[PDB]
Ligand binder design. Structure first.
Ligand code: OGA
Ligand code: OGA
Ligand code: MN
Ligand code: MN
Lengths: 326, 325
C-alpha cells in the first residue's frame, strides 16, 4: 500500500479521521505491533536505551524526587552527562534526551513532512525527544504548550490524562506543584486547580507498539513502575497572535523610529518623561494604523517566522555542544 | 552616574551619555589598575585564572575550526580543558556569561544598566575574549553594545562607522554580502563597505584601554600575540520590542488569539474562504486594542524578555555550572 508513515502507524484510522476528530484537541490511542514503528527513519537507533546512549552525544535532563531530595528542594531537575544520567535513572529520575533528531538526523525529513501533513505553519517548532524511566519515575501533573505524538517502545507506562478546565490553548508550561500562576498564564487562568493526583483523570496504559496522540494543554502525568522507553515527536502550537505580531513587526521594523533604543523613564525629570510620552504617542498612532491595514494574506505570509525562539536557540546551542564528547 | 567615572576619566558620565552613548565609539586610555574597581576583576585578570573558574562550554572560533569541521562551521563549543588546545591553534576563545562565575559583578552590571537608562529587562552579561597567533573575529556588526576592557596584550581593532543601517536589530557578517536577512533588507541603504574595511579606523587596544563599541558599528579584531579582554555586553531593545510586548499582553487573555494557526495553502477552497473572515475579525480586534495602547503600558512592559536567544542560553548554561567537563 502507498501509505504515509503516519498512516501506516494509525491504520486502520485514516489521516482524515485523525485530522477531523482528534487533532488538535482530542487524544488518540493507536495499538498494534511495535514493528510498524520501524518506518520512522532512525527508529532502530533509538529502539533500546543502550542504542540511544550509543548515539546521544549531548546533555541529558533528569527529573524527579531524587533530584528534589539531593537539591534540598531547590529544583526537580538537573542537566548532566549521559553517564551521570544513568546514576539518576537508577534512583527513579526520569531521563529526557531532548533533540534526539540531532543524532538520527534522517528523522528531520520525516518531521518536516508530518508538519506539512498536519497543516502546521512552516515556522512551527519541531523535534524528537526520548523519555526513559524506571522504579516509579516520571513526571508529576502538568500541562505543556506543545503537542506530542508518543511512540511507546519498551515497557508499560501509566499515563493520566485530564481535560483542562483552567486554561484553553495555554501558551506556556505549567506544573500543578505551583498551585501561584506565572504572569501571562495568570491573565487567562480560570477556576480552581485540580488535585495533585488528577483524581478525575483517564488512566491509559501504554505498552510497546502503542502510539498516543497528546493534544496541547491536557493535564497529564506519567509513571513507569518498570523500565520504559518512548520516542516523542513534539510540535509547537503557534497561535494566530504569534503570526499577527510577526506580520505587524515586519511592517514596522522598517521605520527607524521603531528601532530606536528604548529608555527606562524612571530616572528622568518630569518634563523629559512627558516628552517621551508624546514621542510614544506618535509611535502608538502609527502602530495602530499599520494594524488596521493588516490583511489575511500578510498573516499567512508570516507563517515561516520563528514563533519559538526558545526552542530554536536550544537546538542551535545543542548542535554547537556536539563538539564535546559527553 | 558613578560606576564608569574612574575608567573613562577625564570624560564625564554626562559627556558619555550625551555625546557618545548609544551611537559613537569612545576610547579611554589609562592604567590597568583602574579596572580593579570592577568586582571580580582579579579573578579574570589572566587566562589561567579565567580557565580555573569558568565551568561551562567555551566557544572556539577560527581557521582551525573551519579545518576540523571540513568547512562546515568556524565555531563550536568545547570543554574548558579542551579550549587551550584550540587557543594554541589560533582560535579565539569566548567565555560567554563569565558573570555566572563571578556573581559579584552582577550588582555592578545592574548598576551600569540603570545608569545607562536601559529597560529593566535588557539582556546583560560579561564575556571574556582570549586569542593569540592572529586569532580574532572578521568584519561584522552586532545588535548588542559593548564596554570592552583590555586586560592583557595589544589587540588590533578595526572600527568603521555604519553607513548602511541605523539601529540594526540583528547580527551581520560582511562576508555574507550577497545575502541579507529579510528584516535587515527592509532598512539597508547603499553598498556594503569594501573588503577588509579599508577606510576603517585602526585602534590598537593596550592594557588599561577601554573601548565603548556602539551597536551597529562595523568591527573586526586581530591578536598578533596573546590578548585578554573583558566585555560587558548589553542588549539594545527597541521601542518596537516594548510595544509589541505590551500589545501581546493585552491580547493573550483572549482565547481567539491563542487558537492554533494553520498552513494557508494546505486547506480547501471552502476552508480558505472561511479563514479570511475569521482573520479579518481578529485584525479588527487587534487594531482596537492597539488604539488603546498608552505610554504607561509600554513602560509597564520594560521588564519583559526582549532577547529570548540570550535568556535561553543563560538558563541552559546555569544548568551546566557544576557540570564535570
Ligand atoms: O514521557 C513522560 O514521562 C512525560 N512526557 C510528557 O510530559 C510530555 O510528553 O509532554
Ligand atoms: O573581542 C573580540 O575579539 C571580538 N569582539 C566583538 O566582536 C564584540 O565585542 O562584539
Ligand atoms: Mn508533558
Ligand atoms: Mn562583535
Amino acid at each position: 500500500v502507498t501509505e504515509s508513515v503516519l498512516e501506516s502507524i494509525i491504520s486502520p484510522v485514516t489521516m482524515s479521521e485523525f485530522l477531523e476528530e482528534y487533532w488538535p484537541v482530542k487524544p488518540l490511542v493507536a495499538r498494534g505491533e511495535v514493528e510498524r514503528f520501524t518506518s520512522i527513519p532512525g527508529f532502530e537507533k533509538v529502539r533500546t536505551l543502550e542504542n540511544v546512549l550509543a548515539i546521544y552525544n549531548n546533555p541529558v535532563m533528569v527529573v524527579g524526587d531524587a533530584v528534589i531530595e539531593e537539591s534540598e528542594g531547590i529544583t526537580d531537575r538537573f542537566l548532566v552527562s549521559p553517564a551521570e544520567a544513568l546514576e539518576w535513572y537508577e534512583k527513579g529520575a526520569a531521563l529526557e534526551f531532548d533533540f534526539t533528531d540531532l543524532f538520527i538526523p534522517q528523522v528531520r525529513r520525516w518531521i518536516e513532512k508530518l508538519k506539512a501533513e498536519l497543516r502546521l505553519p512552516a515556522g512551527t517548532s519541531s523535534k524528537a525527544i526520548v523519555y526513559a524511566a524506571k522504579n516509579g519515575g516520571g513526571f508529576k501533573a502538568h500541562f505543556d504548550a506543545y503537542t506530542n505524538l508518543i511512540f511507546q517502545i519498551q515497557g508499560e507506562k501509566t499515563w493520566k490524562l485530564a481535560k483542562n478546565e483552567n486554561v484553553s490553548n495555554p501558551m506556556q508550561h505549567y506544573d500543578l506543584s505551583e498551585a501561584y500562576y506565572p504572569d501571562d498564564l495568570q491573565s487567562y487562568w480560570k477556576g480552581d486547580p485540580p488535585k495533585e493526583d488528577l483524581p478525575d483523570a483517564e488512566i491509559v496504559n501504554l505498552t510497546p507498539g502503542t502510539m498516543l496522540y497528546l493534544p496541547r494543554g491536557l493535564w497529564h502525568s506519567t509513571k513507569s513502575d518498570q523500565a520504559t522507553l518512548a520516542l516523542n515527536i513534539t510540535f509547537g502550537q503557534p497561535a494566530w497572535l504569534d503570526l499577527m505580531l510577526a506580520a505587524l513587526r515586519k511592517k514596522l521594523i522598517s521605520d527607524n523610529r521603531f528601532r530606536e533604543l528604548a529608555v527606562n523613564h524612571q530616572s528622568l525629570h518630569e518634563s523629559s518623561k512627558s516628552e517621551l510620552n508624546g514621542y510614544l504617542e506618535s509611535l502608538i498612532q502609527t502602530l495602530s494604523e499599520n494594524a488596521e491595514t493588516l490583511t489575511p494574506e500578510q498573516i499567512f505570509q508570516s507563517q515561516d517566522s520563528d514563533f519559538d525562539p526558545y526552542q530554536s536557540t536550544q537546538l542551535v546551542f545543542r548542535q554547537l555542544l556536539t563538539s564535546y564528547k559527553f
